[PDB]
């Protein structure tokens, strides 16, 4: 619903002759998806990494603590891929990450 | 390239034509080491460790019985070139560990 409202506002701005960047601000969200988080860690963009403790198969995340240690990223193993899915509006998330936040946070 | 002689037999034989050089085909780039690939391979190597036959070969290299180690690597892997390359890689591993310690 939020994306639909943002798209309607951006379409209104385009119709009135303004770019979508004039009406929309830079977003700040958590990062999820295993390939995306691994890419962010390799590019050293992720500030904090949280890995679910119960990923089956375990090979998907068994290298992730070593990768975070080599890249110098703070990582933590947390209980609940369902608990991470509640963050990312899914049933299950294997790993989440923060790259950057707002100034008040 | 060496110009051909124009004769039917001998060294550099064949009909005389001016050879040109070609840009190297991207299908022939296979085997070249990539930065991400070697990074991933090093990470997986330190995560997974070694196979028991590699550990036996490392013990043989540590004791210095190089001929016995090469024979063991040949009878394990199957062929002489693979055995030699694996023994060289384990030389690199042992030298890295010794220079670390």
């Amino acid at each position: 619903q939020e994306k639909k409202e943002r798209l309607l506002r951006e379409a209104t701005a385009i119709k009135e002759g303004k770019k979508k960047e004039d009406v929309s601000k830079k977003p700040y969200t958590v990062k999820y998806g295993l390939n995306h988080v691994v890419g962010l860690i390799e590019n050293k963009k992720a500030s904090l990494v949280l890995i679910a403790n119960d990923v089956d198969p375990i090979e998907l995340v068994v290298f992730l603590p070593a990768l975070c240690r080599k890249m110098g990223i703070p990582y933590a193993i947390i209980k609940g891929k369902a608990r991470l899915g509640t963050l990312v509006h899914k049933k299950t998330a294997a790993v989440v990450a923060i790259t950057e936040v707002r100034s008040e946070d | 390239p060496v110009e051909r002689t124009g004769l039917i037999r001998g060294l550099n034989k064949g009909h005389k034509t001016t050879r040109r050089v070609l840009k190297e085909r991207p299908s022939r780039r296979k085997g070249a080491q990539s930065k991400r690939t070697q990074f991933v391979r090093s990470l997986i190597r330190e995560v997974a460790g070694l196979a028991p036959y590699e550990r036996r070969v490392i013990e043989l290299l540590r004791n210095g019985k190089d001929k016995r180690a090469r024979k063991f690597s040949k009878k394990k892997l199957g062929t002489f070139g693979r055995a030699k390359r694996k023994c060289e890689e384990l030389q690199r591993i042992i030298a890295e560990s010794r220079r670390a310690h």
Binding site: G39, E42, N43, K44 | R36, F39
Partner: peptide
């Protein structure tokens, strides 16, 4: 850093 490719 390790990169898969050059990006925009």
């Amino acid at each position: 850093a390790v990169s898969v490719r050059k990006r925009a």
